[PDB]
Amino acid sequence: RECISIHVGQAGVQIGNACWELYCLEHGIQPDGQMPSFNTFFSETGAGKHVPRAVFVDLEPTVIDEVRTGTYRQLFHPEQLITGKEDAANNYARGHYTIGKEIIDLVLDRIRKLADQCTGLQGFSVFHSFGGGTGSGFTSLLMERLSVDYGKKSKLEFSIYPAPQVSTAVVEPYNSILTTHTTLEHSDCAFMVDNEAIYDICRRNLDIERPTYTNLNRLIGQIVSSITASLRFDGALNVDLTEFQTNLVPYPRGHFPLATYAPVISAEKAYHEQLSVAEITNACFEPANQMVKCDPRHGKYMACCLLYRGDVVPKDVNAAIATIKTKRTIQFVDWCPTGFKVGINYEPPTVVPGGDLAKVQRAVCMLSNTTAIAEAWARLDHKFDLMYAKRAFVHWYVGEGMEEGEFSEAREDMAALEKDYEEVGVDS
Amino acid sequence: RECISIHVGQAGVQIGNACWELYCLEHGIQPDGQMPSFNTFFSETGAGKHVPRAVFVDLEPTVIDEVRTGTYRQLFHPEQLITGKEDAANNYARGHYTIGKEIIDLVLDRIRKLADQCTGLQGFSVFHSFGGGTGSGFTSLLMERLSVDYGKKSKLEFSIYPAPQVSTAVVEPYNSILTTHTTLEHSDCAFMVDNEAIYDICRRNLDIERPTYTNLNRLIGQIVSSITASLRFDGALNVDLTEFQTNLVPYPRGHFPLATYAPVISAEKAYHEQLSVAEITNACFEPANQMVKCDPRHGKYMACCLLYRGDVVPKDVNAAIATIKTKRTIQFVDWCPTGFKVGINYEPPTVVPGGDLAKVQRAVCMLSNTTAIAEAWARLDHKFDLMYAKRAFVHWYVGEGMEEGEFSEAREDMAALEKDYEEVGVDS
Amino acid sequence: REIVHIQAGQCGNQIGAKFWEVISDEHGIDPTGSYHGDSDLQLERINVYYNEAAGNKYVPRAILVDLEPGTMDSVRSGPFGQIFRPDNFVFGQSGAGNNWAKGHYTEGAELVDSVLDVVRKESESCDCLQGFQLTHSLGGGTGSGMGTLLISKIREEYPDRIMNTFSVVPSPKVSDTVVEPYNATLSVHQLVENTDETYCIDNEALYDICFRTLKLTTPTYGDLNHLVSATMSGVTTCLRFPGQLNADLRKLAVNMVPFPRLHFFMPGFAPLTSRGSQQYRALTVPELTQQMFDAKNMMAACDPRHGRYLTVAAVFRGRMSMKEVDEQMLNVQNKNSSYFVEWIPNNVKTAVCDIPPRGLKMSATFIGNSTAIQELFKRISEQFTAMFRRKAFLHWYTGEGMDEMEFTEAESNMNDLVSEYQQYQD
Amino acid sequence: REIVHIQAGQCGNQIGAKFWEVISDEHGIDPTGSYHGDSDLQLERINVYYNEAAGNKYVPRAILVDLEPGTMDSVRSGPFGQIFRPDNFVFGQSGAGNNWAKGHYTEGAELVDSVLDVVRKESESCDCLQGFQLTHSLGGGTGSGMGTLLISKIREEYPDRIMNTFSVVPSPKVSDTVVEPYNATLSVHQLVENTDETYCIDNEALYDICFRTLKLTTPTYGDLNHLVSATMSGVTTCLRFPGQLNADLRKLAVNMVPFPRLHFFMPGFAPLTSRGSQQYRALTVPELTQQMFDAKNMMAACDPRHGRYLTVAAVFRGRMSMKEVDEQMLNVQNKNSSYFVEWIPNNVKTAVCDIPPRGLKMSATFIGNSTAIQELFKRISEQFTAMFRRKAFLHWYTGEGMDEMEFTEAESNMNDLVSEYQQYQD
C-alpha cells in the first residue's frame, strides 16, 4: 500500500519541497536520511537511511539545483533529481514534445525503478501547474506513458489553477486547455487549486500580510498529507484511494473534486478558540475557506468526503453531518442520494517549526464534487476565446509544430466537460 | 439560557467596557481570560480561558482601538472587535446604509458564530445611543437583520436618550426619530436612559462633583447586571426575560419600560444608613432617583417589576408593596389591576474596585411601564419640528439618499406612539 | 393501595421536597433510601409511597417535572435528591413564562407525554393504585398549565382512582403576575371537571400563621412549605398506619363531597404554636379542636365563619379516646351550629389513628368544605375580568393560540362554582 | 454440537474481537488460552467454541478474514490475538473499495477458496457441527461481498447446519458510501436465500442506547460492539450451559421462522442502563421484560409496535422461577396483544438457563420477528432506486462485470420480502 510522488516543474517541485519536509516532520526524519522510526513513502536502505519515493523533474536545471543545494539533498537520491537544460518557455509544445520528449524516457525508467522497489503500489500523486510548460506540457506527456505501463494504479493529480491575478503567462489559457484534455484522458482525479483563494485565506484566517509561495505550499502540503499519510497511518475509519475513486466519480468524466480545509487559523487567533468537530466542518462548508476561487453555494453537491485527524468521535461527526444537511445550503443532486463519506484517523495534525498555523487537536479535509467547478472552466474558456480570436502568440506553438485544430479541439473538449457537469447537476 | 451582548458605537462599547468589567468582577475573571470559577455570558475554551459572548462594532476604528489597547483586550476575541474606517458623521443615513451596510454582514456572521456557540440562547442585549450614527443608524440596520434570523429571541435594547443639556448633534432629533421607529418595529423592549438625570443622581446621592461617562457607565452596567446576571444566577424567585415580555408589554406597542435604581449612595453617606427592603423600594419610587428625565408622579403605572439582590425576604417585599400601594401616588391604570412582579435573587450586589458607591447588602432594580414616557417623546417631537420647519441640515441626509417623507413618517409614528400611551392610560 | 405523586413547577418541586422529606421521616428512611426505622409499621405500608429497591433501599413513587433544569437540579442536590431515581426527573429548558398556553397548550404537552409514560410505568409497578397526588401552583405556567394537562390524561387513563391535588392559591397580596388570574381561571376551569379534590392553600394565610402563631419574624418558604407538608402527610397517616377510623382517601372523598362540582378544600392544622408557649400547653382533644376550628389556624385564606359548612373532616393522630374525640367534635358542631349547613346532621366526621407525628403526642388535621371558599374565587374572577375586558396581555396567550371564548367559558365555569356555593349556603 | 465462527471485514473483525473476548470470559479462559475458570461447566461445553490445545489451552473455532492486513494485525495485536492460531488469519492486500463486485464477484473469491479449506479443516476437527456464525457488514465489500460468497459455499457443503449471521444495517444517519445501498441490496438478495437467519443491528439505535440509557457522551465502537457481543453470547448460553429450556439454536429457529423467507431478526437486551440508576434497580423478571419489550432497548433501528409480531424469543440467564418468567411473558402478550399477530397463539417463547452473565444476577436477550422490520428494507431499497435509476457510480461495478439485471433482480427480491411482511402483517 505504497506510493510514489512525482514533482514536475517548479510548481511541482517547490510544493514537493514542503511535502517532503512535512513528511520528515511527520516521522522525525533527519535531512541525512536517518530516521528512527512511513513506509509508504520511504524505502529503507541498509544504512538506516530512508529515501523518498519520488521523482523530481525540471527541464531547466535551476530549480533542481535549488533542491540539490538544500538540506534535504541528502535525503533525495541523486537519480531522483532529473534535469534538462532549457525550459519549455511556458509552452506545452515544448513541454509535451519538443524538449520534454527527450528526457521523459529517463524519468519513466526511474519511475519504473521505484515501481519495482514497491511491493504493493497503490498508486501515485503528481504535482504541477496548469499554466506552465514543464508543469503542464511535460506532465501531459508523462501521464500518457504512465497509463500505459501502470494503467490501473491511482493517478492523482494536483494542479495549480491560474488566477486572474497571477498571471505569468499570456498563453496560460492555451497551456491550460491543452493540458486539461489530457488530464481528462488519463487522470483518475484532478485537484485544482487557486493560489488567489489561498492568499485570501492566509491574509484573513492566518492573518498574513504578505503571503508567499512558501507559506502557500505549507498549507497545501498539509492537506495532501491529510489525505494520504492519514490513510497510511491507521486510524478508526481508514479510507483508501480506491474508495475515493469509487465514491467520488459518478461518471468517467467527473473527476474533479475540489478541496477545502480547516482549521486554518493563526496561533494568535486560535487562542481562544476551540473548535469542535462540527465547528470545523462548518468552516469546511464555508466558501471563504475554499481553496479554489468559486462559489460552493452556487453549485450543487454530488459527492463529499470528510477526513479527520486527531481527536474526533464518529458520533460527533454524525451530528455534524445532520447539521450540514439541515443547515445547509448543500443542494445535493438527485442522482446521488446521500453521499457523505467519512474517514477518521487517529493521527494528529502536525505542525511545521516556524509555521504559520496554530497547533491543532483535530483537523478536517473536505473533498467535494460540486457543479460550481464549471464556473472556473467558464473563465478559462473566455480567456482562450480572446486570445484565439486574435490568434495572438499562436506562432509560439505552431512554430513548434502544433496544429490550429488542436487548440480548437481542446477548448471544445472543455466545453463538453462543463456541459457534462451541467447535465449531472440536472436533476432527474 | 445564554445570551449575547452587542455593543455598537462608542456609547455601546464604552458602556460595554464597564459591563464586561463588571462581569469580571462578578466572577473573578482575569483580564487574560483566566477564570477560576458564568456561563451565560462566557464560553470556555480548552485553555481555561473564557471568552465574552459579545460583539463590538464601531465604524471608526478609534474606539475599538481603545478596547484593543486596554487590559481586557486579552479577554476579547479578535474576531469580536469589528471596525470600519469612517464614522457615520452622526447620521443615520450613513449608519444605517451608506457605510454601515458594508460591514453589517461581517457583524451578523460573527453573531451567528456566537449563536451557534450557544446551546440555548435566550436572547441578546444591545447597547447604543439614540443620537449617534453608528449607535442609532447602524443599530437599526442590525435589528432588521437579527429579527430575520433569530426572530423570537429576546431583543433588549438599551438606548441613550439625548439630553437637552448634552447635545452633541444638531440633528439628534432626526437621528433619534428615525431610529425610534425601527426599534418599535423590531425590539422587544427598549430602555432609554438620560445621562442628565444620571448626573443629577451622581451629584446628589453619590455626591460627585464632576461626573464623567466612566462613572455613569458603572451605574448603568450594574443595573443591567442586576437584571441579567441575577437571573442567571439563581435565587429565590427567578424571573426570566420571557416573563418580562409577558408581564411588561400590554400591547405590542408599549414596549418602553423605564429604569430607576437604588441604593445609589456614596460610601460616605452610606455610613449610617441602613436601608430596609421597604426603604430601598421607597427610594425606587422617588423621581429624584429616576434614571430618565421625566416625572413618575405625573404619569400612571401600568407595569412595575422589582428585582432584588442580596438580603431580601419575600415578606418584607410584601409589606413594601402594601406601602407603595398605600403611600403612593402610584396611579395604576384600570387596564391592569395589580401589576407588581417580584424577582428575588440571593446574589449580593457587587462592588467595583475604585468605585463610587457604597458596598450594599441589598439592592433594588425598578422597571416600569408608565405613561410619563410620553413626556420625553413630546420633547423630541418639538425639537424635530423646529429643525424640520427650517429644514436645516436636511441635505446631510437627503444628499446621502434619504427621502423627505421618511422623516415626516418617522415623526408621525412617534406621535402615534405617544397617542397610544395616552389611550392605554385612559381608564376604561 | 398505592399513590403516585407528581411535583410540577417550583412550587410543586419545593413543597414536594418537604413532603417527601417528611414521609421518609415518618418511616425511618434516611436520605440514601435506607431503612433505619423504629417500627415494623413503618415498613408495613411503605408501599403506598415507596418501591423497595435492592438492599432495603426505597424509592419514592413520584415524578419531578418542570421546564427549568435549575430548579430540578436544586432539588436533586438536596437531601432526598438521592432518594429519587434519575427516571423521575423529567424536564425541559425554557420555562413557560407563566403562560398556561405555553405550559398546557403547547410546550408543556411535549413533556407531558413522556411524563405519562413514566406514570404508566410506575402504575404498572404498583399492585393496586389508590390514587394520584399532584402538587402545583394555580398561577404558574407549568404548575397550572402543564399540570392540568397531565391531570386530564391521567384521569382519562384511571377513571376510578383518586385524583387529588394540592395547590397554591393567588391572593391580592401575593400576586406576581398580571396574568396570574388568567392562569388561575384557566386551570380552575379544568380542575373542577377533572379532579376529585383540590386543596386551596394561600401563602398569605400561611405567612400569618408563621408570624402570628409561630412567632416568626421572617417567614420563609422553607417553613411555609413545611406546614403544607404536615397537612399532606396527615391525610394519609391512617392509610399508612393502623388506626380506628377512616383510613381510606376514597372514604374521605365520599364523606366530603356532597355535590360533584364542589370539591375545593380548606386545610388547617393543630397544634400550631410557637415553643415559647408550648411549655404552657397541655394538649387534649378540646385543645386540638379549639385550634383546628379557629380560622386563624387555617392554611386557606378564608374564614369559614363567613360562610357555612357543608363538611368537616378531622383526622387525629396519636392515642386519644373515642369518646373524647367524638364528644368534643360533636360539641364543636353543637356550639358553632350557626356556621354549619342544616342539611347534614352530623357534619363533622372523624378519623382517628394510632400513630402520632414525630415530636408530638397528638395532632390533628382539619379539612373543611365551607361556602366561604367562594371568596377566593371572587378574588380571581374579579381580577380576571378587569384584565380580560381590556385584553391587557392577552396577546401573549393569543400568540400561543388561545381563543377569547376559551377564557370566556373558563370564567363562566368559575361563576357557576360560586353560584353553587351560594345555592348550598343558604 | 460445535460452531465455526467467521469474522469478515473490519466490522466482523472488531465485533468478533469483542465476542471472543466475552466468550473466553464466560469460560474462564485467559488471553493466552489457558483455562482458569471457576466451574466445571465452563469446561463442559467449551467444545462448541474451542479446541483443546496441548496444555489445557484453548483455540477459538473461528476464522479471521479480510483484504486488509492492517486490520487483521490490529486484532492480532490485542488480547485475544494470542488465543487465535496463525492458521485462522486469512487475508489479502488491497481492500475491495466497498465494492461487492470486487469482494463477492472477483477478488474476495480468491481468498474464499482458502478460507473454505480452513473451514473444512475445522469442521473435520469437530465431532458434530451445530452450525456456523458469521459476523459482517451489510454495506461493505468484504463484509457483504466476500462474506456472502463464503456463505453460499458453506451452505452448499453443509445443508443441514445452522447458518446464522449477525450484520450491520445501514441507516440514513450512518451511511458512508454512496454505493452502500447497492452493496446492501446485493447482499440481501443472496442472504435471503442462503441463510437460516440474520440479525439486523443498526449503529444508529446502538448509539441511542449508549447515550440514552447508558448515559454515555461518547459512544464508541468499542462499546457498541460490546453490546452486540452481549446478544451474541446470550443466544448460546443455554447451549453451553445447563438449563431448562431451549438450548438448541435449531429449536429456536423452528420457533422463530414461520415462513422460509422471513428470517430477519430484531435483537434487544436487558438490563441495559447506566450505573447511576443501578443502585435503584431491583431486577425481577417483570423488570427484565419491561426493558426487553421496550423498543428503546432494541439494537435494531426499528420499533416493533409500528408493525406486528410474528415471533418473540426471550432467553433468560440466571436463576429465575418458571412461573415468574412464564407468567410475565404471557402477560406481555396479554397486555400488548394489539402488537402481535393473531395467527400464533402464544407468540412468546422462552428459554431459561441457569448461568448468569458475569456481573449480573439475571439477564435477558430479546429476539424479535416483527413486520416493522420492513422499514429497514424500505430505507435501503429506496436509496437504491435513486442511485440505480441514474446509474450513478454503477460503472464501478460494471467495471467488475456486474449486470444491471443482477441488480434489478436483487431489488425485486427485496421488494418480495417487504411484501411478505405486509402479507403477514395483516
Ligand SMILES: Nc1nc2c(ncn2[C@@H]2O[C@H](COP(=O)(O)CP(=O)(O)OP(=O)(O)O)[C@@H](O)[C@H]2O)c(=O)[nH]1
Ligand atoms: N407556598 C409556596 N408557593 C410558591 C413557591 N414557589 C412559587 N410559589 C407560588 O407559585 C406561583 C408561581 O409559580 P412557580 O414557581 O410554581 C411557576 P412554575 O415554575 O409552575 O411554571 P413557569 O411558568 O414555567 O415558571 C405563585 O403563586 C408563587 O407565588 C413555594 O416555594 N412555596
Ligand SMILES: Nc1nc2c(ncn2[C@@H]2O[C@H](COP(=O)(O)CP(=O)(O)OP(=O)(O)O)[C@@H](O)[C@H]2O)c(=O)[nH]1
Ligand atoms: N457496529 C459497527 N459497525 C462497523 C464497524 N466498522 C465498520 N462498521 C460498519 O460496517 C460498514 C463498513 O464496513 P467495513 O469496515 O466492515 C468494510 P469491509 O472492511 O467488510 O470491506 P472493504 O470494502 O474491503 O473495506 C459500515 O455500515 C460501517 O459503518 C464497527 O467496528 N462496529
Ligand SMILES: Nc1nc2c(ncn2[C@@H]2O[C@H](COP(=O)(O)OP(=O)(O)OP(=O)(O)O)[C@@H](O)[C@H]2O)c(=O)[nH]1
Ligand atoms: N502554490 C504554488 N504555486 C506555485 C509555486 N510556484 C509556482 N506556482 C504557480 O504555478 C505557475 C507557475 O509555473 P512556472 O513556474 O512558470 O512553470 P513550471 O510549471 O515550473 O514549468 P516551466 O514553464 O517550463 O518553467 C503560476 O501559476 C504560479 O502562480 C509554488 O511554489 N507554489
Ligand SMILES: Nc1nc2c(ncn2[C@@H]2O[C@H](COP(=O)(O)OP(=O)(O)OP(=O)(O)O)[C@@H](O)[C@H]2O)c(=O)[nH]1
Ligand atoms: N452613558 C453614556 N453615554 C455616552 C457615552 N458615550 C457617549 N454617550 C452619549 O451617547 C451620545 C453620543 O454618541 P456618539 O459618541 O456621538 O456616537 P456613536 O453613537 O458612538 O456613533 P457615531 O456617531 O457614528 O460616532 C451622546 O448623547 C452622549 O451623551 C458613554 O460612555 N456613556
Ligand SMILES: [Mg+2]
Ligand atoms: Mg520552471
Ligand SMILES: [Mg+2]
Ligand atoms: Mg463613535
Ligand SMILES: [Mg+2]
Ligand atoms: Mg419555573
Ligand SMILES: [Mg+2]
Ligand atoms: Mg476494510
